[PDB]
């Protein structure tokens, strides 16, 4: 009995609903890229922790107004000054240096003229302040940027470089994050050879393992190569058991249609005792796409049995697998980014929703990018065109018409 | 003497023109992600290498037309068949199995009915072919997809997962690519502490090293952490010499304005004998941004002395450093992707071209994303807003107006 055709919407929501969120671990902040915080992060110090000059210039008393001032010393970066500025006096300051006691404003060097220096020309002695400073001018008070006790990053934040910098700033060098999924990939088929092999009669090289492992690695997840498994139930069960032991997620390709030696659904159900949530999807390509869960000792393993056809395997990996992995690593909304683009070519619509790799390109002062289906040879696919199902209204789309494109590449 | 203010356009083209393309190396195909091919890649075999069924069904003689046929055996994946189909006969085939001699079309199982099998139900004996096959139907002839001798990937291709899969397909497991730049990063300043440090009087934690190293790592390039260097010329020269020895690219931050202990431009020029191409840029932020080259024994080293202010450092790293690194690793057009977006807020224009990190978001059936300047807390910046310089015409931009945004994040 073939599995029912599942709608694309039901298949997608089933994957996101049934996929678990992994547990947490503590990592070093420098390893945080792409991770999601599983804790709020608080500042234990003020930034700045002293009142800090915004400018190279002089720390003044604003009430002194403009005029000729004695320079009593310098506040240099990294040193707490010892002197107090009294009416009629200033102190040289650089950007980020602490404001001495008695000063309440900074005048930038451009609003001054130097009168007298040392014979050595090594120390400034007297400066003319040309402006009326507003009290507080060109000073960052204590805690201006960050206050001690302030939550600087919330749980659920998907971190990039600026978040790593903020953790460095506040000295929070160890953070709780969700784990990344470990993803095991196997290919299936008596016809497959390794990429390293010379061909033999009746055989081809396995490409899907390489393309799927590279797709998963591109997203920063650790992988396990489970090799090529023959079209026989004992070997497939042994290979799945190894995947279940070593990984959070198992991806197979091939063996999921209704051919004589397409064995994966029987093994998953009868031999492995997994729950197949769907075994066919009304989509083009990807009709035999299969999703299963296996609950062992309160851990949920995820199994994607993708179609053998290489184009089908990479398309379905992008539609179902990548969003699942994003939910497992803690991303709150793991759905892919969908943009609007202009079709570069007429297309006939299928009764199934249809998906095709494409390259998005932005032209001069055009608001929408163009989507060109796979010098364009020099660029990798960065989109998956998402064509609507044919209706009595729409049977075809034309060049220039606006379509949905899922981002799968950096633009 | 302060360096001249360089226009943003001149500074950008100067970086791309003066940056070298690195040499080549041979890598394993599985390490190819993000690499650029430095050779054309040819197929040494046909794909498919035998005539291959598109379908699960039967290899027939089209000239026999519809009717009741003797099944003489099965062509299974991975096995070269030995039998010849004669008029009145067929052979069972699965998808990707070789077409036996004497057959010239495949009829899919849905266009057939089984009559007689074995008592064991193990072998099919006679099938009714319900359709008139077109000769060649549902067969991929030898070389249909790829011909022996065909160039499958050109030099200059920036590889992603599908290109790795194609290399696996054709069995080209070793490829010539451009090297990736090794990028050394140092921070400068007597006020800086490591992220791991508790604060001491007058000091702050170094954030730029973390944020810049993470920015470079995000793009897949190897890095070298050169630590914190004090505000003194001997230490800065020693640290630059170490960078020059260990890396292709040296990034510093701080010490590039006109403050008393801002020493980097003097060291680069007088002590290191580098060529400073620009030392100030008419941009906001990033006024003191400095770019230098150093030619040693026919190798060009690249030095970016970025501003100390953390926001300035990350913005300038994205504008100048990342495109330079893309040219060094062989990308033919290393410029960043610029998209059009709608401003989420009114903005006053500066006389300088102004740049600010933002988050791009696509809303339901809206052609243009919105750019929101830095649940939005849960997302990392993925754009740099590129605001035009103020003119007598435009002094301000309004919410909803269309602006340029540089992609710096996966969308």
């Amino acid at each position: 009995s073939p599995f029912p055709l599942t709608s694309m919407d039901k298949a997608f929501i089933t994957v996101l609903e049934m996929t678990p969120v992994l547990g947490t671990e503590i990592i070093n902040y420098r390893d945080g890229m792409g991770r999601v915080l599983a804790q709020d992060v608080y500042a234990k110090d003020n930034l700045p922790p002293f009142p800090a000059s915004v400018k190279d210039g002089y720390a003044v008393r604003a009430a002194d107004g403009p005029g000729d001032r004695f320079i009593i010393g310098e506040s240099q970066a990294g040193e707490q000054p010892t002197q107090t500025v009294m009416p009629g006096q200033v102190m040289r300051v650089t950007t980020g240096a602490p404001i001495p006691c008695g000063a309440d404003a900074v005048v930038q060097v451009e609003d001054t003229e130097l009168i007298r220096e040392s014979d050595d020309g090594t120390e400034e002695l007297e400066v003319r302040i040309l402006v009326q400073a507003r009290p507080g001018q060109d000073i960052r008070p204590i805690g201006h940027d960050i206050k001690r006790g302030e939550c600087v990053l919330a749980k659920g934040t998907h971190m990039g470089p600026s978040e790593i910098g903020l953790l460095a700033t506040v000295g929070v060098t160890e953070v709780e994050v969700n784990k990344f999924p470990v993803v095991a990939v196997m290919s299936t088929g008596n016809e497959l050879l390794n990429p390293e092999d010379d061909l033999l009669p009746g055989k081809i090289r396995d490409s899907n393992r390489s393309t799927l492992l590279a797709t998963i690695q591109e997203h920063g997840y650790p992988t396990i190569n489970l090799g090529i498994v023959g079209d026989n139930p004992d070997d497939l069960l042994n290979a799945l058991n190894e995947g279940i032991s070593r990984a959070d997620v198992i991806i197979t390709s091939g063996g999921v249609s209704m051919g004589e030696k397409d064995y994966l659904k029987q093994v998953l159900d009868i031999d492995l005792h997994a729950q197949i949530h769907f075994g066919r999807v009304f989509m083009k390509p990807g009709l035999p796409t299969t999703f299963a869960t296996l609950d062992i000792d309160g851990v949920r393993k995820i199994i994607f049995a993708l179609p053998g056809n290489p184009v089908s395997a990479v398309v379905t990996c992008n539609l179902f697998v990548v969003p699942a992995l994003r939910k497992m690593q803690g991303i709150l909304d793991p759905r892919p980014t969908i943009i609007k683009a202009r079709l570069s070519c007429d297309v006939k619509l299928d009764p199934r929703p249809e998906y095709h790799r494409c390259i998005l390109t932005w032209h001069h002062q055009e608001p929408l990018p163009w989507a060109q289906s796979t010098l364009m040879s020099m660029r990798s696919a960065n989109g998956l065109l998402m064509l609507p199902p044919k209706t009595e209204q729409y049977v075809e789309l034309h060049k220039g018409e606006v379509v949905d494109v899922m981002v799968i590449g950096r633009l | 003497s302060p360096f001249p203010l360089t226009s943003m356009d001149k500074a950008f083209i100067t970086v791309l023109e003066m940056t070298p393309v690195l040499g080549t190396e041979i890598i394993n195909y599985r390490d190819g992600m993000g690499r650029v091919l430095a050779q054309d890649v040819y197929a040494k075999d046909n794909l498919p290498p035998f005539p291959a069924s598109v379908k699960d069904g039967y290899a027939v003689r089209a000239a026999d037309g519809p009717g009741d046929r003797f099944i003489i055996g099965e062509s299974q994946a991975g096995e070269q068949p030995t039998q010849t189909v004669m008029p009145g006969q067929v052979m069972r085939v699965t998808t990707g199995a070789p077409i036996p001699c004497g057959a010239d079309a495949v009829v899919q199982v849905e266009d057939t009915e089984l009559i007689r099998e074995s008592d064991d139900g193990t072998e099919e004996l006679e099938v009714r072919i319900l359709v008139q096959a077109r000769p060649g139907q549902d067969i991929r002839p030898i070389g249909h997809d790829i011909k022996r001798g065909e160039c499958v990937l050109a030099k200059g291709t920036h590889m992603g997962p599908s290109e790795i899969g194609l290399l696996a397909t054709v069995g080209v497991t070793e490829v010539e690519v451009n090297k990736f730049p090794v990028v050394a990063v140092m921070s400068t300043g007597n006020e800086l502490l490591n992220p791991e440090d508790d604060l001491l009087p007058g000091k702050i934690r170094d954030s730029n090293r973390s944020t810049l190293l993470a920015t470079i790592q995000e793009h897949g390039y190897p890095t070298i952490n050169l630590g914190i260097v004090g505000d003194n010329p001997d230490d800065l020269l020693n640290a630059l010499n170490e960078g020059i020895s260990r890396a292709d690219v040296i990034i510093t931050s701080g010490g590039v304005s006109m403050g008393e202990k801002d020493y980097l431009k003097q060291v680069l020029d007088i002590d290191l004998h580098a060529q400073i191409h620009f030392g100030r840029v008419f941009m906001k932020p990033g006024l003191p941004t400095t770019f230098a080259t150093l030619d040693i024994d026919g190798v060009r080293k690249i030095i970016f002395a970025l501003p100390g202010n953390p926001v300035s450092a990350v913005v300038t790293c994205n504008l100048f450093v990342v495109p330079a690194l893309r040219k060094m690793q062989g990308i033919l057009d290393p410029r960043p992707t610029i998209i059009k977006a709608r401003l989420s807020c009114d903005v006053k224009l500066d006389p300088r071209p102004e740049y600010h990190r933002c988050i791009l978001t696509w809303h339901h059936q809206e052609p243009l994303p919105w750019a929101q300047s830095t649940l939005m807390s849960m997302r990392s910046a993925n754009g740099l807003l590129m605001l035009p310089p103020k003119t007598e015409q435009y002094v301000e931009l309004h919410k909803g107006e269309v602006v340029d945004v540089m992609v710096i994040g996966r969308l």
Binding site: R335, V403 | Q365
Partner: peptide
């Protein structure tokens, strides 16, 4: 958001 592609009404 929908995983199935839609036609554009503007």
């Amino acid at each position: 958001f929908n995983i199935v592609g839609t036609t554009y009404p503007c």
